[PDB]
Amino acid sequence: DPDKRRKTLVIIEKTYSLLLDVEDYERRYLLSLEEERPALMDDRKHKICSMYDNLRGKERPSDDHFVQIMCIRKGKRMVARILPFLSTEQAADILMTTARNLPFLIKKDAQDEVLPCLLSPFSLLLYHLPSVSITSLLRQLMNLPQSAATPALSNPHLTAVLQNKFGLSLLLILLSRGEDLQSSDNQWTEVMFMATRELLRIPQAALAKPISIPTNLVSLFSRYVDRQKLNLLETKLQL
């Protein structure tokens, strides 16, 4: 696979050129006729999808093509800039895959430590996603069994997430977002138990330091636990 990355770099540079052109739409737009406004946005869409396809690499695309790109320094940063341009559906897919292959991506991020850059774009995307997507993302992130049978023990996938800066951060905002849909009018009752329990297990030192901390966490946790376990979640998470 020494040639596998040589192909990846080519894709990155090919996509980076598209990016700078897409980021230039704002300018080439202010000096164009009225007739061009609809047509120029259409051309912008096609390029955004061109970048999107360069990620998934599209029968249905190998889930590995996008993973390898998420192993290169300049590759992970490029994705962070492509996310804001992608549509809700496209971005929801990129996020899903990231969580599905997170432990590996984290292992490869150990040296560089540049994953945190993806936290900002993803946090904004969640508010376009309904309750279904939120819970669905939580199941994959924590890697719950397909059989939906509540595990009594921990798993390598979920654990690697809590001991990570980005991983733990992404988990909190997903719950935080899940808190929004909840109060405004349950599938969370089965996903929350797993989140709270695992957080109420992994030792203080093992758990990593979140980049940020959602304010509405104390309220969300108090919905599923008692005052004694709640005070523990507040201690470890620095709530």
Q: List Cα–Cα distances, 25 to 29, 121, 138, 199, 204, in angstroms.
A: 6, 20, 35, 45, 47
In the numeric block, which tokens belong to residue 109? Answer: 């991020």
CB 136 within 8 A of CB 146: no
* Longest Cα separation, the chain: 65
Burial class of residue 5 in the structure, from the number of CB atoms within 10 Å of its CB (0-12 exposed, 13-18 middle, 19+ buried): middle
Distance (Å) of CA 9 to CA 2, 69, 71: 12, 8, 11
- Report the sign of the C-alpha dihedral through residues 89, 91, 95, 97, in that order: positive
Residue length of the chain: 239
Running DSSP on this structure, what letter comes out for residue 112?
T
DSSP category for residue 113: -
Q: Whole-angstrom Cα distance, residue 96 to residue 202?
A: 24
CB 95 within 8 A of CB 148: no
Q: Is the torsion defined by CA of 209, 212, 218, 222 positive or negative?
A: negative
Residue pair 19/78 in contact (Cβ under 8 Å)? The answer is yes
**Technique used by the depositors:** X-ray
Resolution of the coordinates, Å: 3.1
Distance CA 26, CA 51 (A): 18
CA atoms within 13 A on the CB side of 36: 8
**Helix spans in the chain (H):** 2-22, 25-28, 36-56, 65-69, 73-82, 88-100, 102-109, 119-125, 131-141, 156-162, 165-183, 188-199, 217-221, 227-236
Domain boundaries, the chain: 1-239
Please state the φ and ψ torsions of residue 20, each to the nearest 5 degrees. -60, -25
Query: How far apart (Å, rounded) are the C-alpha atoms in residues 98 and 50?
Result: 19
Q: Supply angle C-alpha 20, 77, 12, rounded to 5.
A: 60
